[PDB]
Amino acid sequence: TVGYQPYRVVVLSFELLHAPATVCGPKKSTNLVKNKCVNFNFNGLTGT
């Protein structure tokens, strides 16, 4: 019992190009559709 009382702190540092890309955000995927021309970016395949 603000500026003097304890505050926890966590600092993040991401590396790059030393090792293959491994840690990163999720894959926001949705539903698919049948029998209609769809523009779909299929886990890296961007075809229509």
Partner: protein, 35 residues
């Protein structure tokens, strides 16, 4: 680093399937095996 393996019951023809790629990134020259 990629691995491919297969099992069968050495003459003839067969085809090797993969199992896994490990995104490790290790400089590799030696593959000491274990008995």
């Amino acid at each position: 680093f990629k691995i491919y393996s297969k099992h069968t019951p050495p003459q003839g023809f067969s085809a090797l399937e993969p199992l896994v790629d490990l995104p490790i990134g290790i400089n590799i020259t030696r593959f000491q095996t274990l008995l």
